[PDB]
UniProtKB/Swiss-Prot annotation, chains A, B:
<dbReference type="Pfam" id="PF00089">
    <property type="entry name" value="Trypsin"/>
</dbReference>
<keyword id="KW-0964">Secreted</keyword>
<comment type="similarity">
    <text>Belongs to the peptidase S1 family.</text>
</comment>
<keyword id="KW-0645">Protease</keyword>
<feature type="disulfide bond">
    <location>
        <begin position="131"/>
        <end position="193"/>
    </location>
</feature>
<dbReference type="InterPro" id="IPR033116">
    <property type="entry name" value="TRYPSIN_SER"/>
</dbReference>
<dbReference type="InterPro" id="IPR001254">
    <property type="entry name" value="Trypsin_dom"/>
</dbReference>
<dbReference type="InterPro" id="IPR018114">
    <property type="entry name" value="TRYPSIN_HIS"/>
</dbReference>
<keyword id="KW-0865">Zymogen</keyword>
<keyword id="KW-0378">Hydrolase</keyword>
<feature type="disulfide bond">
    <location>
        <begin position="183"/>
        <end position="212"/>
    </location>
</feature>
<dbReference type="GO" id="GO:0006508">
    <property type="term" value="P:proteolysis"/>
</dbReference>
<keyword id="KW-0222">Digestion</keyword>
<keyword id="KW-1015">Disulfide bond</keyword>
<feature type="active site" description="Charge relay system">
    <location>
        <position position="187"/>
    </location>
</feature>
<feature type="active site" description="Charge relay system">
    <location>
        <position position="97"/>
    </location>
</feature>
<feature type="disulfide bond">
    <location>
        <begin position="37"/>
        <end position="53"/>
    </location>
</feature>
Amino acid sequence: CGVPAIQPVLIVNGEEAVPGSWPWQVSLQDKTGFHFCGGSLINENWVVTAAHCGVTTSDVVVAGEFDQGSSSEKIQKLKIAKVFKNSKYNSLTINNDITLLKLSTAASFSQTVSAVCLPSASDDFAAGTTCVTTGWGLTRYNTPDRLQQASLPLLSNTNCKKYWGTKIKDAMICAGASGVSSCMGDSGGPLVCKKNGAWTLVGIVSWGSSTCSTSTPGVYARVTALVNWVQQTLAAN
Amino acid sequence: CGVPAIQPVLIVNGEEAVPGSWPWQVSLQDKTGFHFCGGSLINENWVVTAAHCGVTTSDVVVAGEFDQGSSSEKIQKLKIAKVFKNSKYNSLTINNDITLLKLSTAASFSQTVSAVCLPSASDDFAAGTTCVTTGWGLTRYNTPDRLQQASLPLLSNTNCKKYWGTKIKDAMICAGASGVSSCMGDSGGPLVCKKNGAWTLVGIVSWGSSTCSTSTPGVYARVTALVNWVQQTLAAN
C-alpha cells in the first residue's frame, strides 16, 4: 500500500493534483451523481470515510476520477454492500468520526486506483510534520471539477485546544492553520503522511471552520485511535 | 393523525414535556444505545428524520420513551428495514434535509405512540405563528434524560436571511430567535404547528447556531417542500 504508480507532485488554497496521483481517493456520490464526500480505499473491498458523511447502500463509491466533469476517464462506480459506522461515533461531538464501506463488488486495482496504508495504533505522528489532504470540496467558501491537494502541518491536541477548546478529543487530530483549509465536500477524505516512501492515512477529513478559515486548524479523525476497530471490522466481514 | 391521546401542556430554555404527550417523537439510537437524533412517526411503518442524521440499518428507532434513563417505560425498539435519503439532499448546504425510515416491523400504536400529520405542499405556515419543537438534545451547550419541548415562532425566509444570508434555501424554514434553541441531539426531530385541533409537521430539526444561541434563528427542513417526495416514497414502498 501507499505507493502511487503515478507519483504525486506537490480545499481552499490548494492546487490541482497530477491526475491519478492519489489512487486511494474515491468520491461518495448520491443517486443523482452529486459528490458529497471523499473516501479512501484500504483494499479492493473496503473504503474508509467519515461517519458524518452519512453514507447508505443507495450511495455509490466512485474510483479513478480526477475530473468529475469529464466523461473520458476510465472510472469505477462501485455499489456498497454495507455501511459499518464505528459504534464509538458520537455525532453530537463529531468524535470517532469513521465509517467503513464494504463494496458489493471489488475494485479493480490499477495505476489510478490503489490502497493507502493504515498505521499501527501505537504510531507517532509528530506535531510539525507535513502531510497532504486531497478532495473535491469547495475551493472558496465554488466547487472544483478536478481533484485538489494541499500540504499542511500536524498540530498537537494541546495547541489545537487553543482554538477549539473542549471540542478536541483524543480521537481527533488537528491539521492546517497554515494558509490552506479542508472545506465542505472534503469530508471523509484522506489526510496522508509520507514515510519510508509510502503514504499512511493519519486522518479522515472531519470538521473545521464554519467558513473554511485558512488560519484555523482543520480537525480530522485520528486514524491511530480507530485503526483497531478498522482491523476488527475487516477481520469479521 | 396529530391528536395526542395524552394532551401536551405548554433544547435550550425548554421545559420538560408531559410524559407521552408527543407520541410521534422517536429517538434514533446507535448499537450502543446512544441517542444521536430525533424522528417523527408518520404511520406505523415509517419514520421521518433529517438526512444529516446519517441513519443506517444498524441504528434503531425507539418509540414511547419519555425518560431515556428509565427502565420502567413500555417502549418499542424497532429495527429499520431501509433508509430513504431524499436524492435532493445536499449535505454541503444542508438543503432538503430529510430521510424516511421504513421499519422492519410495524410500530404498535398506543396512547404513547402515534403519528404526526403531514401538510399539503401548498399549505401556508405564516411568519409569527407559534409552533413547538421537541427532543432530547442538549439543554446547555448537558444532556437530558427526559423529553423537552419549547414553543417558538416561525420566521419568514427573508427575515431569516438577515442572520444567515445565502445559507437559507427554499427548502428551509426558520424558527426561534425567541429565547429558546434546538441543540445537538435535537436534529431529525419535529417542529409541529397546531391547527383545526391537530399537530402538523412543518419542520424537521436541521441546523442552527454553532453554540445553540437563543437569539439566533433555528433552521428546519421545510416539510411543505418535501412532502411530495415523502408521499412518492411511501407510495412506492
